[PDB]
């Protein structure tokens, strides 16, 4: 079943998004551009551990 993950900003802020994924099917990480509220720009977010 899908497991929760965190998406941490590449900037120095501590902002993060949250979602889930299928680890068995797609085993690589996710690199997706999102808006960072603290710096008010679109930056790249990287997968991390929910726990």
């Amino acid at each position: 079943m899908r497991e929760l993950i965190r998406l941490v900003s590449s900037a120095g802020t501590g902002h993060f998004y949250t979602t889930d994924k299928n680890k068995r099917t797609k085993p690589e990480k996710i690199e997706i551009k999102k808006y960072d509220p603290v710096v008010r720009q679109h930056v790249i977010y990287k997968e991390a551990k929910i726990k």
Binding site: L4, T18, T19, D20
Partner: protein, 63 residues
């Protein structure tokens, strides 16, 4: 003797000149499967419902 206020009711409701304040429920955990719009509109403080005032005021010993 003096009337004793309910301890847990005074930790959840605050008296103001506009009524009684409280926070919203369904915001403690299980937050990923929730929409951002739903989590954004459960964030502030609301006033007590018209039909709820009498029960809460009795617990707070305000009447």
């Amino acid at each position: 003797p003096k009337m004793k206020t309910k301890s847990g009711a005074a930790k959840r409701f605050k008296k103001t000149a506009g009524g009684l304040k409280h926070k919203h429920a369904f915001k403690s955990h299980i937050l990923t499967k929730m929409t951002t719009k739903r989590k954004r509109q459960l964030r502030g403080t609301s006033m007590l419902n018209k039909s709820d005032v009498a029960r809460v005021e009795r617990s707070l010993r305000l009447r």
